[PDB]
Design a protein around this ligand. Sequence first.
Ligand SMILES: CC(=O)N1CCN(c2ccc(CN(CC(C)C)S(=O)(=O)Cc3ccccc3)cc2)CC1
Length: 234
Amino acid sequence: ASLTEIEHLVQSVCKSYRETCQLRLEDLLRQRSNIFSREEVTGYQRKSMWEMWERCAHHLTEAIQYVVEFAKRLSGFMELCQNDQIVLLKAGAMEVVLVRMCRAYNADNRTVFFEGKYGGMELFRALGCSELISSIFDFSHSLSALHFSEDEIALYTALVLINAHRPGLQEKRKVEQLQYNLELAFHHHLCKTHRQSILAKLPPKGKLRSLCSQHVERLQIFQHLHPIVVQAAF
Ligand SMILES: CC(=O)N1CCN(c2ccc(CN(CC(C)C)S(=O)(=O)Cc3ccccc3)cc2)CC1
C-alpha cells in the first residue's frame, strides 16, 4: 500500500466510525450537566436485579448492533468468509463496546450516560456486581485520561476487531493482511496528528480481554435465566 492508499484507509475507517458511533460525542458532552438526582438514583437502586438486567441487556444489545455495523463497513471485512466475520465479532464486539464506553464517561464526577442522564456506579447497585461495575468505571477513567479523539477511537477499535490471533480463523493470512494495513493506518495517522504519545499509554491487549471475560461471565448468568428480544437498526 502507498501513503495515498493508507490515508484513504484512515479516512474510510473514520467515516465508518462516525456513521456507526451510536451516540454523537457532541451530544454526550452537552448532556454531562444532566445528572440523576438522589431520588432518581434511589429509584434505580430499588429496581429488581431482573429489571436492571433487562435494561442493561437492551442497551448492550443495541451497542453491539452498532459495533457489528461498524465492522461491516470496514474495508475488507465483508470480503472475509462468513465464519471469520463471526469469529472476529464474537471475540471482539463486546471489547469494542467497553472501549466505546469511555466517550460516555465523565471523569470529572465519575458518571456514565445511562438512559438519558449521567449516573455513578451506585446507580447499578441492584445488580450486586459492584466489583465488575467498579472495574468498568476504572477502565473508562483510564481511557478518558488519554482524551481519545473520535478518529483515534475509530482506528483503535478497528484494531480491537481485526486481530489475526483469534482462535478459529479459517483465512488467518487474509486477517493478518487487514490487521497490518490497519496498523499502518493507525500509526500513520498518529504521526500526522502528533499523537505518537498515545500508543505507549493504551491499555495492554490483555487488560481489555480480562475485563471483557469478567463482563461476559456476569452477562451469561443473567441471560441464561432472563432472555430478551431487542429491536435491530438496519
Ligand atoms: C455507544 C455509547 O456511547 N453508549 C452509551 C453507553 N451505553 C451503555 C451504558 C451503560 C450500560 C450499563 N453497563 C455499563 C456499566 C457502566 C454499568 S452494563 O450493561 O455493562 C452493566 C452490567 C449489566 C449486567 C451484567 C453485568 C454488567 C450499557 C451500555 C452503550 C451505548
